[PDB]
Amino acid sequence: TVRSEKDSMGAIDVPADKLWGAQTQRSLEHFRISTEKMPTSLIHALALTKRAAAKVNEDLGLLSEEKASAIRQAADEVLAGQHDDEFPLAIWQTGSGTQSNMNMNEVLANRASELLGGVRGMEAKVHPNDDVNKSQSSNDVFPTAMHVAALLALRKQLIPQLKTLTQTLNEKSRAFADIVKIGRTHLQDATPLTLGQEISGWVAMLEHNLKHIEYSLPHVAELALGGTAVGTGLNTHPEYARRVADELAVITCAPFVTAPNKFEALATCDALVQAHGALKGLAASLMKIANDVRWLASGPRCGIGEISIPENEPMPGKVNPTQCEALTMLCCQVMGNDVAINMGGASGNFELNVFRPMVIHNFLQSVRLLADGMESFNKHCAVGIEPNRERINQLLNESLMLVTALNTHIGYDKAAEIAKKAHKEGLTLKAAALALGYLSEAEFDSWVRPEQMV
Amino acid sequence: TVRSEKDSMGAIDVPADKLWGAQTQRSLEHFRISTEKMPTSLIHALALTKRAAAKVNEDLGLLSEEKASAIRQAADEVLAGQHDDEFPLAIWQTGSGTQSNMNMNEVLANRASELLGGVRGMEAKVHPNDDVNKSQSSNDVFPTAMHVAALLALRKQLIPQLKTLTQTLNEKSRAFADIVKIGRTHLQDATPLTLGQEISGWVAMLEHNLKHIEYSLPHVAELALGGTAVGTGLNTHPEYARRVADELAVITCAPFVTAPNKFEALATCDALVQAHGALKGLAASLMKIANDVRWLASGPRCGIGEISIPENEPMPGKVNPTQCEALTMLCCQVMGNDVAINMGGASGNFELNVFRPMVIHNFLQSVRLLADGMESFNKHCAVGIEPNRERINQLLNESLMLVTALNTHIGYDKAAEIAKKAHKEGLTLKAAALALGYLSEAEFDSWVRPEQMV
Amino acid sequence: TVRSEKDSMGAIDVPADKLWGAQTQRSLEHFRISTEKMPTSLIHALALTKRAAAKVNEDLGLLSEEKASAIRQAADEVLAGQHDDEFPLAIWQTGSGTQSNMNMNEVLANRASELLGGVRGMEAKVHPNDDVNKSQSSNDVFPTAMHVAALLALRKQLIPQLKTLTQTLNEKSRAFADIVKIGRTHLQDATPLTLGQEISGWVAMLEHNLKHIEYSLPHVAELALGGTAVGTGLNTHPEYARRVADELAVITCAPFVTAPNKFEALATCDALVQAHGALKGLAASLMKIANDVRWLASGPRCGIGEISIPENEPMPGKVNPTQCEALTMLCCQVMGNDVAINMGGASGNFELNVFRPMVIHNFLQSVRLLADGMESFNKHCAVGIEPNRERINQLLNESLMLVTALNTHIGYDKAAEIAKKAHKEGLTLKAAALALGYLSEAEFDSWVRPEQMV
Amino acid sequence: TVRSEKDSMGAIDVPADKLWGAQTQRSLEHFRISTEKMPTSLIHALALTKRAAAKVNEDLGLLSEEKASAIRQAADEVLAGQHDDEFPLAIWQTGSGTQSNMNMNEVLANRASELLGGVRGMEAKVHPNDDVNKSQSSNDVFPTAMHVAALLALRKQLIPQLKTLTQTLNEKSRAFADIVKIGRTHLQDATPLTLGQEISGWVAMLEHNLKHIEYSLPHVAELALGGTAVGTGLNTHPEYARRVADELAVITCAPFVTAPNKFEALATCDALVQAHGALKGLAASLMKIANDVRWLASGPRCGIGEISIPENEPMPGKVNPTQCEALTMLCCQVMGNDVAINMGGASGNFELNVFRPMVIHNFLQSVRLLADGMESFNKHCAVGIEPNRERINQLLNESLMLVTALNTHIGYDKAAEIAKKAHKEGLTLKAAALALGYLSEAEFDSWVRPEQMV
């Protein structure tokens, strides 16, 4: 029920029913820190990187077609979800991520050996370093997998959910474009606007956020692979960097390119620091939108109550805005994640930044949170937003903001005293214009038109 | 392979092999956000809270001995690790944590029913709300479980690992108390001190941190249970708050007490905001210590190299300080976690703070990271720290800092010109005192005594 | 209109009408970075430190009574506000703060020389290094001034304003202890409580914050002076550390003591990292209180409107809560300051932390903001908080939360259908109990008693 | 020595020698919070906004040529630095910034009146609201001044200093392109690279940062002016928004445009949240570069010592890297500023974000710090960076990294045992290849060529 695997330090027992090797077993035993492991997206990006590396090595005659094809088949099994329990290492490992690199090397090598009729272990047909890490160093693969995982998650998860939410709110803005409501500035009653105009603010924010996220993608698309140990490219084929970047782009349809400067690519996590800046921008925007929604829906009777939202969980009328709560809670998380990333990104030394598992742990979490959170908020809240037209009108007409519709029909002097009297006395603006008798109730209803004040 | 469970909203299918109920199934389906779930420590704190609530209800004749005893037996099974797959809810749920409260209510109720020869579900012998949540509201249990989990993890995990690491470094400080080395200020050569004096700085920092963490514990030990819905205690026995706090203290041996002001306890997460302030203090101290260790061990030949550390992973002499890398990486994480907690803690509204799953998610993660990280750093690094005495002496004697040992034997004028000549010329201070001939090599070796300059 | 001053690097022109010297002029010209300078509190703490150092040197016969007395008289002039334009250095200077140390040395030395009938400059009677920095190093004075300034500002500014605000809100809580209002959880209508009970939550938070701030003071009271260059105390009298700490305590009435471990005191800013943790705790509490106040006062007609606040600035009824805006804005600032401090505190190296001007800049700013902000919020807002009793009662009685007062007079079944009918139909709970005729309006007014539900 | 000025609240005394009015005096007395005031750049942006507003009002016949021309002349005096003591308001004021808007209205109105032969005060010829705020609301001017100030400071200060620093390091990278040095990964000796290759990493980082900053400028260039009170544009000429944006662009040569969605422009600070994300990216990059410089220059004898830097301040050889200290200290500040900005940006409510003075205070500080800090670092440090060629070669040749130059001349087996022997024994790789006699010293010097390993 165990197997003896070897590395440059000796032999160690690994679980017989597992595909990993000596370096993984050592890391697994030396970093028993908390519960965070590499996320599946990073595992898949690592498998993709080894699949592209294998194909390019084959193309260059540096690795046999049998070994190359067996490696790509094993990597496709990882990508297909067959080997999730084969990657047990903690986030809190060596700062370069090289132990997770070896975890992929060993799992792919053993599984490739099986696929060629060999065994897993010392006598395997495919070797983790010699074959699966061929033309790679210990230092330039993990940074590559970080950018592959990050770019694919922004393109395939976050941007599509962002676009869907924007379209829902754009539709809602159009449907409610002629519902006039009271404005609120400093939380006080203010000049009116339409519910559709207010939502159009939310829509415009999400469109700006999309642009900012898109501006960050070209830097993330630059890959370190080919820099080898310190960025010089020593001990790799001079076409390898460009060729692997080219293969990754083919098999993902994403515009990966090799990093024009490998020293910047290995010494920093700057592309992710910058990209996460755009995500904390989105988190601040989503906080605002979520808060507007839950405040406008507050009630049923002692809040604002201008809109209603769907009731999805198990005393009538009480609807806790639980999607707004999950959303605001994960927006706080993104702000915190940004500080952790900023500290790691600032803390590179010389030729290599060794804060990488932590940086990518936070970055991919922020993407999951923002993508899944907008998907959940959209389907369980935003699509169901409806006005409470009686309440909106009650608030608007019983307010004192509409007095300014009277200044060319009575002068600022008399309207001001209607406003003052109605307020000291607790009256409408109609009732206070009648008691002082500067107006008839037909004169009011024709002069104070909220629909022309927007 | 399914079961129909009911709540105030209707009936829903749950997995037949699971013990949860309708509210858990709904939350599980409505918050498909990322992968973070409640940590085991929080689950256990919830089970402890229900076990104490049951015992107190029994004491007050509010619940039968059969039901009460079956609930405590089920909770003990949770505490014993038999039901880990029965708690599937996300962190990113309702902000009060009430859905995880219901998850514990339903699992304990069904399992209790089984333990009394009943079924799980509609016809169960024990009811989630009526029995397991008896004398509790939906709002005051989750805050209680937060403080129970946090206090127990600080007392049982973090403080013992902190104490162990402090003792290791205190021993190392004693063993190396008479090894003189060059000091470094602004990263430049400076006035000497002993390696034991330098480590005593690390020791003193960890002793201060322990005090700061201990000062935060009395506020965390205040429990919200008994405040019920808004803090007034309406709809609970007037002795319930004190009695449950008293029972929790009995069964954990921790000094839990009921919160003197339930409005502060429900409306805020202030005790954890303050407590996490002490943890980010520890993270900043640990960053410094870890960096000192990896810098002092840098080499083998082109760094500082004054100490050696154990080599635990698989080109001689290269030892990557991987424990220092994991430690500094998790210290960044704690700084980020603190910002997320601060934002949640600042964002309470009226009678209830609804940022709680996020706050406790971050807080318990910081405790795991700091506790497990000091345990790992201690056993795989700190215990093995050794001086490189030849290197320490080489640096010290070949430096220019020891010139000031000559000012009462030659005056500040001649020593200054030895220092200047040795530096322009690339000589020792002995060699430069010989070429200008102000001293004999026996006069030097008797006057420049590093051991008296500390 | 210039004067030639000298240091170990040569001669440089300083403004003739200024008291500073060569090192100050150099720093002034080399760090033209932004506009932040040392705050007055830090200048005063530096002057206090030199006044105590002078007195102790005199006591030890290390400095003449004439020079010592002239130095203390000059320092008293600084403390008296006569020399504010004599300290022009930026925060963004050398990381040890040693240039601001020299700024105090030179200003005090020249002014002391004047006070003895000498000139300012090369021929002065008192020397900046030889006399004013006597028994001090370049490294242990600035950390001392940081802790002196921080401790005095917490004791003399922040804690008294915190105590005053707490007393105002405690009085308001007592005055409104029997005004019943609707509770709000998740922003939804909930179980009632009194306005005084709600404010008592604010009061309890501020009392907890005071305790947390007080727990941080003993570590701040530890002073580095006497550690000299690297903490060994080399080149100072063996009683100097304790004696100066003792003199500082005499002349400030604050419990300053010498740091038991000088290596921790020079290598870190841990005491301020920990102390600022308590201040960001206060900022989160103050955010919550300020938000409760501005939300409860929102209106005049389309918000909550349960309380009124004073109108201090220049359309009736609109009162922008501008004190709440200043307060919440400075609470954000404290959260940001905490991150800057945490990064600096984590970034010490070997024998000296050289992030100190930045750390103390942020820390003293947070204290000014919190102290002055609570003083301003108290006098221009909190003291004037009044209930709007008609509005509070309107909301409470027109809500659906009071239905549960009927369950022992009608059973949960009939009350639930009153609640449902009133809500589908837009009625009071009285009106809906009449239409279905389960109650008389005298039966209602006797059964639904809000004053017994708190 | 006082003057009675009036607003809608009454009359108040202002200093007779000052140009401000009633609203400024009130704000000045009600927000005695700390010492931070609006920075000059914001004052100038406000003056620019009023100068453009005046010109456009004149164009539309809404204001006389005399009044319009007098306002623009007064604003030009502000821009010319004649009125710096006329703007005394705190950052910690009303959250909309409207009191600083009124401060500019009153100062320009009084000074304009003087320029027309009138008095300052009640009888002035030009009115603050009626004339200087004409066609503007209280809510849309301050956000406009924020974006004007931010865009101009990024274009005129930060980007030019960033470009200058990049050019210096690009020149240094070219000059040192063939100096081979030891690489460092995880702080351990690693594969060699040239000093010019390493600096090219710094250069590439700064070029990426420039691109990221440039991507943020189009959103900052969108101006809120014309949205008036809540974004609807009610009570302003329908061409005003576009016309003022157009005039601002003329007189600044910056591409200002009117915000396509005024609700997003008033309800959020999203453009600055996003733009500050790029600045904290730059801060993390600058931290890394500064740390590389001070570590490489550490010495003179017990550090790395591979480069030298200029000595600008007043024991030979000790050069404290004080420019690196100021730079790293202000990079921490930017990280903290980003959190304060993120919290303010996330905290908008409905139609107006009222965290604006705090947001712009932090944002313009980060720009001053980064711009002035790179200017100071460039001129007092970076331009003077020189290699220590003897030290670089000593480290490189005495290291064990060059063993791999022997594997096709001896096989990995014998080289590995040279590496091992030299390390256990404390020898060079030449000396250890001689003792075991696998090589002649002429065979070594011809095979181990560092210049071909990069």
Side-chain angles (χ1 to χ4, degrees), chain D residues 50 52-54 56-58 60-63 105 128-138 140-141 224-229 233-241 244:
Chain D
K50 300 302 182 168
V56 168
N57 272 330
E58 154 153 61
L60 294 179
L62 306 161
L63 180 87
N105 283 332
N129 293 156
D130 294 347
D131 305 316
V132 165
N133 219 63
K134 169 175 303 300
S135 315
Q136 300 151 69
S137 89
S138 60
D140 59 334
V141 186
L225 214 70
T228 69
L234 176 81
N235 293 323
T236 201
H237 187 303
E239 308 183 50
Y240 200 62
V244 180

Short mmCIF file of all heavy atoms in Angstrom, two decimals, chain D residues 50 52-54 56-58 60-63 105 128-138 140-141 224-229 233-241 244:
data_model
loop_
_atom_site.label_atom_id
_atom_site.label_comp_id
_atom_site.label_asym_id
_atom_site.label_seq_id
_atom_site.Cartn_x
_atom_site.Cartn_y
_atom_site.Cartn_z
N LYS D 50 -13.58 77.23 -12.60
CA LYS D 50 -14.36 78.47 -12.57
C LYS D 50 -13.98 79.39 -13.73
O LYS D 50 -14.83 80.14 -14.24
CB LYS D 50 -14.15 79.21 -11.26
CG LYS D 50 -14.55 78.43 -10.02
CD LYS D 50 -16.01 78.02 -10.06
CE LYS D 50 -16.38 77.30 -8.78
NZ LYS D 50 -17.84 77.12 -8.64
N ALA D 52 -13.08 78.38 -16.74
CA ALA D 52 -13.73 77.82 -17.92
C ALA D 52 -15.24 78.01 -17.86
O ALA D 52 -15.87 78.32 -18.88
CB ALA D 52 -13.39 76.34 -18.06
N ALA D 53 -15.83 77.82 -16.68
CA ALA D 53 -17.26 78.05 -16.50
C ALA D 53 -17.63 79.49 -16.83
O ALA D 53 -18.67 79.74 -17.47
CB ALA D 53 -17.67 77.72 -15.07
N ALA D 54 -16.80 80.45 -16.41
CA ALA D 54 -17.07 81.86 -16.68
C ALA D 54 -17.05 82.14 -18.17
O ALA D 54 -17.99 82.72 -18.72
CB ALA D 54 -16.06 82.74 -15.95
N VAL D 56 -17.54 80.11 -20.60
CA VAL D 56 -18.65 79.49 -21.32
C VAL D 56 -19.95 80.24 -21.04
O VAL D 56 -20.78 80.43 -21.95
CB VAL D 56 -18.78 78.00 -20.98
CG1 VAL D 56 -20.12 77.45 -21.49
CG2 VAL D 56 -17.62 77.22 -21.59
N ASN D 57 -20.17 80.65 -19.79
CA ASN D 57 -21.35 81.44 -19.47
C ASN D 57 -21.39 82.72 -20.30
O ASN D 57 -22.44 83.08 -20.86
CB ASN D 57 -21.37 81.77 -17.97
CG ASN D 57 -22.05 80.69 -17.14
OD1 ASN D 57 -22.96 80.01 -17.60
ND2 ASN D 57 -21.63 80.57 -15.89
N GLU D 58 -20.25 83.42 -20.40
CA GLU D 58 -20.13 84.58 -21.27
C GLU D 58 -20.53 84.24 -22.71
O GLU D 58 -21.32 84.96 -23.34
CB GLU D 58 -18.70 85.11 -21.22
CG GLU D 58 -18.22 85.87 -22.46
CD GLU D 58 -17.12 86.90 -22.15
OE1 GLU D 58 -16.04 86.51 -21.67
OE2 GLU D 58 -17.34 88.10 -22.39
N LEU D 60 -22.50 82.06 -23.78
CA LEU D 60 -23.93 81.79 -23.85
C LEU D 60 -24.77 83.01 -23.48
O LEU D 60 -26.00 82.89 -23.33
CB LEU D 60 -24.29 80.62 -22.93
CG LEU D 60 -23.73 79.23 -23.28
CD1 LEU D 60 -24.17 78.20 -22.25
CD2 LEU D 60 -24.14 78.79 -24.68
N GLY D 61 -24.14 84.18 -23.32
CA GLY D 61 -24.87 85.36 -22.90
C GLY D 61 -25.50 85.26 -21.54
O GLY D 61 -26.44 86.01 -21.23
N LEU D 62 -25.03 84.34 -20.69
CA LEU D 62 -25.62 84.18 -19.38
C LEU D 62 -24.95 85.04 -18.32
O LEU D 62 -25.47 85.14 -17.20
CB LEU D 62 -25.58 82.70 -18.95
CG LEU D 62 -26.18 81.69 -19.92
CD1 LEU D 62 -25.70 80.26 -19.65
CD2 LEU D 62 -27.69 81.76 -19.88
N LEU D 63 -23.81 85.65 -18.65
CA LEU D 63 -23.09 86.50 -17.72
C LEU D 63 -22.38 87.59 -18.51
O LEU D 63 -21.84 87.33 -19.59
CB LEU D 63 -22.09 85.67 -16.90
CG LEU D 63 -21.21 86.36 -15.86
CD1 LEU D 63 -21.94 86.43 -14.53
CD2 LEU D 63 -19.91 85.59 -15.72
N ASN D 105 -15.79 80.11 -4.79
CA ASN D 105 -16.79 81.06 -5.27
C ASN D 105 -16.60 82.42 -4.62
O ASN D 105 -16.58 83.45 -5.30
CB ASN D 105 -18.20 80.55 -4.97
CG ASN D 105 -18.66 79.47 -5.93
OD1 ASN D 105 -18.24 79.41 -7.08
ND2 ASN D 105 -19.55 78.60 -5.45
N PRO D 128 -20.93 85.36 -5.19
CA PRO D 128 -20.36 84.00 -5.27
C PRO D 128 -21.28 82.99 -5.92
O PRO D 128 -20.87 82.29 -6.85
CB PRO D 128 -20.06 83.66 -3.80
CG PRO D 128 -20.95 84.56 -3.01
CD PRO D 128 -21.08 85.83 -3.81
N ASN D 129 -22.53 82.90 -5.47
CA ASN D 129 -23.46 81.95 -6.08
C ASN D 129 -23.99 82.44 -7.42
O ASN D 129 -23.93 81.71 -8.42
CB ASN D 129 -24.59 81.67 -5.11
CG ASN D 129 -24.12 80.94 -3.89
OD1 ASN D 129 -24.73 81.00 -2.83
ND2 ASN D 129 -23.01 80.20 -4.04
N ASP D 130 -24.51 83.67 -7.45
CA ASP D 130 -25.25 84.15 -8.61
C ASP D 130 -24.36 84.22 -9.85
O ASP D 130 -24.80 83.90 -10.96
CB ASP D 130 -25.88 85.52 -8.32
CG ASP D 130 -26.97 85.46 -7.24
OD1 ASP D 130 -27.42 84.35 -6.88
OD2 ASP D 130 -27.38 86.54 -6.75
N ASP D 131 -23.11 84.63 -9.67
CA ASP D 131 -22.20 84.81 -10.79
C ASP D 131 -21.14 83.71 -10.88
O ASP D 131 -20.96 83.12 -11.95
CB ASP D 131 -21.52 86.18 -10.67
CG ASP D 131 -22.53 87.33 -10.58
OD1 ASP D 131 -23.51 87.31 -11.35
OD2 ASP D 131 -22.35 88.24 -9.74
N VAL D 132 -20.45 83.40 -9.79
CA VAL D 132 -19.25 82.58 -9.96
C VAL D 132 -19.64 81.11 -10.05
O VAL D 132 -19.00 80.33 -10.78
CB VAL D 132 -18.26 82.86 -8.81
CG1 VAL D 132 -17.17 81.80 -8.73
CG2 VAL D 132 -17.67 84.25 -8.98
N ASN D 133 -20.72 80.72 -9.37
CA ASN D 133 -21.32 79.41 -9.48
C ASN D 133 -22.45 79.36 -10.50
O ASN D 133 -23.26 78.43 -10.46
CB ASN D 133 -21.85 78.96 -8.12
CG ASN D 133 -21.63 77.47 -7.88
OD1 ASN D 133 -20.48 77.02 -7.82
ND2 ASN D 133 -22.71 76.70 -7.74
N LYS D 134 -22.55 80.33 -11.40
CA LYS D 134 -23.67 80.34 -12.32
C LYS D 134 -23.61 79.12 -13.24
O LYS D 134 -22.54 78.76 -13.75
CB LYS D 134 -23.69 81.62 -13.15
CG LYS D 134 -24.67 81.60 -14.33
CD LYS D 134 -24.75 82.96 -15.06
CE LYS D 134 -25.13 84.12 -14.13
NZ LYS D 134 -26.46 83.94 -13.48
N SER D 135 -24.77 78.48 -13.44
CA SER D 135 -24.98 77.29 -14.27
C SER D 135 -24.37 76.03 -13.66
O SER D 135 -24.33 74.98 -14.31
CB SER D 135 -24.45 77.45 -15.70
OG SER D 135 -24.80 78.71 -16.28
N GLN D 136 -23.90 76.12 -12.42
CA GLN D 136 -23.30 75.03 -11.68
C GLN D 136 -24.20 74.70 -10.50
O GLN D 136 -24.97 75.54 -10.03
CB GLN D 136 -21.89 75.41 -11.18
CG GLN D 136 -20.91 75.75 -12.29
CD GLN D 136 -19.86 76.74 -11.86
OE1 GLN D 136 -18.98 76.43 -11.03
NE2 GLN D 136 -19.93 77.96 -12.41
N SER D 137 -24.12 73.47 -10.01
CA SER D 137 -24.81 73.10 -8.79
C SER D 137 -23.80 73.05 -7.65
O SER D 137 -22.62 73.36 -7.81
CB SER D 137 -25.56 71.77 -8.99
OG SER D 137 -24.75 70.64 -8.68
N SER D 138 -24.28 72.67 -6.47
CA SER D 138 -23.33 72.51 -5.38
C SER D 138 -22.57 71.19 -5.45
O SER D 138 -21.61 71.02 -4.70
CB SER D 138 -24.04 72.62 -4.03
OG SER D 138 -25.04 71.63 -3.89
N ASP D 140 -21.62 69.15 -8.57
CA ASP D 140 -20.90 68.68 -9.75
C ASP D 140 -19.59 69.42 -10.01
O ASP D 140 -18.86 69.04 -10.92
CB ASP D 140 -21.79 68.73 -11.00
CG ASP D 140 -22.33 70.14 -11.32
OD1 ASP D 140 -22.45 70.99 -10.40
OD2 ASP D 140 -22.61 70.37 -12.52
N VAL D 141 -19.26 70.43 -9.21
CA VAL D 141 -18.01 71.16 -9.42
C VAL D 141 -16.83 70.47 -8.74
O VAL D 141 -15.76 70.31 -9.33
CB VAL D 141 -18.15 72.62 -8.93
CG1 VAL D 141 -16.92 73.40 -9.28
CG2 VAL D 141 -19.36 73.29 -9.56
N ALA D 224 -17.64 65.61 -14.56
CA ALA D 224 -19.03 65.60 -14.09
C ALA D 224 -19.78 66.90 -14.39
O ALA D 224 -21.02 66.87 -14.39
CB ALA D 224 -19.10 65.34 -12.59
N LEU D 225 -19.08 68.01 -14.63
CA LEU D 225 -19.72 69.32 -14.74
C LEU D 225 -20.82 69.34 -15.80
O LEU D 225 -20.60 68.94 -16.95
CB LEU D 225 -18.69 70.42 -15.04
CG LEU D 225 -19.08 71.75 -14.37
CD1 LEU D 225 -18.96 71.77 -12.87
CD2 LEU D 225 -18.30 72.90 -14.98
N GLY D 226 -21.99 69.80 -15.40
CA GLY D 226 -23.18 69.72 -16.21
C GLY D 226 -24.19 68.72 -15.71
O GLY D 226 -25.37 68.83 -16.06
N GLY D 227 -23.76 67.74 -14.90
CA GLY D 227 -24.74 66.87 -14.25
C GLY D 227 -25.62 67.60 -13.25
O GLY D 227 -26.69 67.07 -12.89
N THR D 228 -25.21 68.79 -12.81
CA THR D 228 -25.85 69.53 -11.71
C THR D 228 -26.18 68.60 -10.54
O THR D 228 -25.40 67.71 -10.22
CB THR D 228 -27.09 70.30 -12.19
OG1 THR D 228 -28.15 69.39 -12.54
CG2 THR D 228 -26.73 71.16 -13.39
N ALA D 229 -27.34 68.79 -9.90
CA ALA D 229 -27.53 68.28 -8.54
C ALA D 229 -27.48 66.75 -8.46
O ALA D 229 -26.88 66.19 -7.53
CB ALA D 229 -28.84 68.79 -7.96
N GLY D 233 -28.92 67.14 -15.12
CA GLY D 233 -28.65 68.38 -15.81
C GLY D 233 -29.72 69.43 -15.63
O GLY D 233 -29.67 70.47 -16.30
N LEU D 234 -30.68 69.20 -14.74
CA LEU D 234 -31.73 70.17 -14.51
C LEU D 234 -31.12 71.48 -14.03
O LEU D 234 -30.20 71.48 -13.21
CB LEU D 234 -32.74 69.63 -13.50
CG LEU D 234 -33.88 70.54 -13.06
CD1 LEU D 234 -34.99 70.52 -14.10
CD2 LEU D 234 -34.43 70.11 -11.72
N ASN D 235 -31.61 72.59 -14.59
CA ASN D 235 -31.16 73.94 -14.24
C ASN D 235 -29.75 74.22 -14.76
O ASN D 235 -28.90 74.77 -14.05
CB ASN D 235 -31.27 74.20 -12.73
CG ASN D 235 -32.71 74.24 -12.24
OD1 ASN D 235 -33.60 74.74 -12.94
ND2 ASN D 235 -32.94 73.72 -11.04
N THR D 236 -29.50 73.86 -16.01
CA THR D 236 -28.30 74.31 -16.69
C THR D 236 -28.57 74.29 -18.19
O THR D 236 -29.44 73.55 -18.66
CB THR D 236 -27.08 73.45 -16.32
OG1 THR D 236 -25.87 74.18 -16.59
CG2 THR D 236 -27.06 72.13 -17.11
N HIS D 237 -27.83 75.10 -18.92
CA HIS D 237 -27.99 75.15 -20.37
C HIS D 237 -27.63 73.80 -20.99
O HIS D 237 -26.61 73.20 -20.62
CB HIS D 237 -27.13 76.26 -20.96
CG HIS D 237 -27.34 76.52 -22.42
ND1 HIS D 237 -27.19 75.54 -23.38
CD2 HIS D 237 -27.68 77.65 -23.08
CE1 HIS D 237 -27.42 76.05 -24.57
NE2 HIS D 237 -27.72 77.33 -24.42
N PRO D 238 -28.43 73.29 -21.93
CA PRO D 238 -28.16 71.95 -22.50
C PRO D 238 -26.84 71.82 -23.23
O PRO D 238 -26.42 70.68 -23.50
CB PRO D 238 -29.35 71.75 -23.45
CG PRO D 238 -30.46 72.52 -22.79
CD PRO D 238 -29.78 73.77 -22.29
N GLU D 239 -26.16 72.90 -23.58
CA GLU D 239 -24.82 72.77 -24.15
C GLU D 239 -23.71 72.95 -23.13
O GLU D 239 -22.53 72.82 -23.49
CB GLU D 239 -24.60 73.79 -25.28
CG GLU D 239 -25.64 73.83 -26.37
CD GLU D 239 -25.24 74.82 -27.45
OE1 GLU D 239 -24.08 74.75 -27.93
OE2 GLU D 239 -26.07 75.68 -27.80
N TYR D 240 -24.05 73.26 -21.88
CA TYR D 240 -23.04 73.69 -20.91
C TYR D 240 -22.00 72.61 -20.67
O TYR D 240 -20.79 72.88 -20.71
CB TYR D 240 -23.72 74.08 -19.61
CG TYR D 240 -22.86 74.96 -18.74
CD1 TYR D 240 -22.47 76.22 -19.19
CD2 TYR D 240 -22.45 74.54 -17.49
CE1 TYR D 240 -21.69 77.04 -18.41
CE2 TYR D 240 -21.67 75.35 -16.70
CZ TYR D 240 -21.29 76.60 -17.17
OH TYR D 240 -20.51 77.41 -16.39
N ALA D 241 -22.45 71.37 -20.43
CA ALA D 241 -21.52 70.29 -20.11
C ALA D 241 -20.44 70.15 -21.17
O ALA D 241 -19.24 70.24 -20.88
CB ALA D 241 -22.29 68.99 -19.92
N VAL D 244 -18.04 73.45 -21.45
CA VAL D 244 -17.03 73.65 -20.41
C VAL D 244 -15.91 72.62 -20.53
O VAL D 244 -14.72 72.96 -20.46
CB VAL D 244 -17.67 73.60 -19.01
CG1 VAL D 244 -16.60 73.81 -17.95
CG2 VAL D 244 -18.74 74.67 -18.89
#
